[PDB]
Write a protein that binds this ligand. Sequence first.
Ligand SMILES: OC[C@H]1O[C@@](CO)(O[C@H]2O[C@H](CO)[C@@H](O)[C@H](O)[C@H]2O)[C@@H](O)[C@@H]1O
Ligand code: NA
Length: 288
Amino acid sequence: HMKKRQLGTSDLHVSELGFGCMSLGTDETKARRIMDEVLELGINYLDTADLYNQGLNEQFVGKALKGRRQDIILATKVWWWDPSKAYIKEAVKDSLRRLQTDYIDLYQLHGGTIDDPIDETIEAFEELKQEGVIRYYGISSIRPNVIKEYLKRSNIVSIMMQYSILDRRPEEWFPLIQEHGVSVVVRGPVARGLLSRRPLPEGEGYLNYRYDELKLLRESLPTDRPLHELALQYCLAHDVVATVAAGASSIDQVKANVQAVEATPLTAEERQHIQKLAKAAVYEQHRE
Ligand SMILES: OC[C@H]1O[C@@](CO)(O[C@H]2O[C@H](CO)[C@@H](O)[C@H](O)[C@H]2O)[C@@H](O)[C@@H]1O
Ligand code: NA
């Protein structure tokens, strides 16, 4: 019942819910148990990169892939900052060794800026792709100047962005991304718990929302779906979004995310109501 979407123009067909950001823990047996359940739910997209400062243990994920690697789409990212070709090419070797596999499906640049050596970076990814060490590459960025450079100059297939009802800054860039045949991978779709059952911490805001505005918005949003489901479905209602990496701290939370993603898509009345009710901010920094 887990649907898939094409990632950009690539041959990667990713589950609409992806898995990432878990302390799979200290015990291998239980980590493998968690992974078996993730895959049983029809999730086929595993991103080992840190999201909100938690990644996936590559040694454990490697052991979970045993016997089924061909059916899983594996993503990773690229201490001493060294922005060279040689660094990008050497970093992926480490992940491959830990993962006990010989290719990565999607290799993603984190920490990019417009002052980086952009041709060198693109060349490193293209050389890895031509050699088959990776199948495709992408970036993780909320900087429009970085995004525009890689859309114009490279063959990225994906951009990972923080995106939710409460952070609609990405939407400005969706037409440009889609015109280039690129997809968005979403992080933070539940706004780190602000679009769930957890209390809004008193007095605290979120981006350009004050506390009182978060309270009013929770209450004014449609109530015929749980808020968590409305949040995930709002992200998915945009064709540019290929997959959402929602946070989880347990198998029960993964199962809740799966149930929400497999719910009925938003209609027009629903998506429009949300667009009108929620702020539509833009990025202030790194625009050009
Ligand atoms: O204030 C003008 C205009 O800005 C919006 C943008 O969403 O609200 C921002 O400004 C308010 C007044 O300073 C803040 O209370 C609010 O937190 C902030 O987002 C609009 O709501 C408002 O019309
Ligand atoms: Na614009």
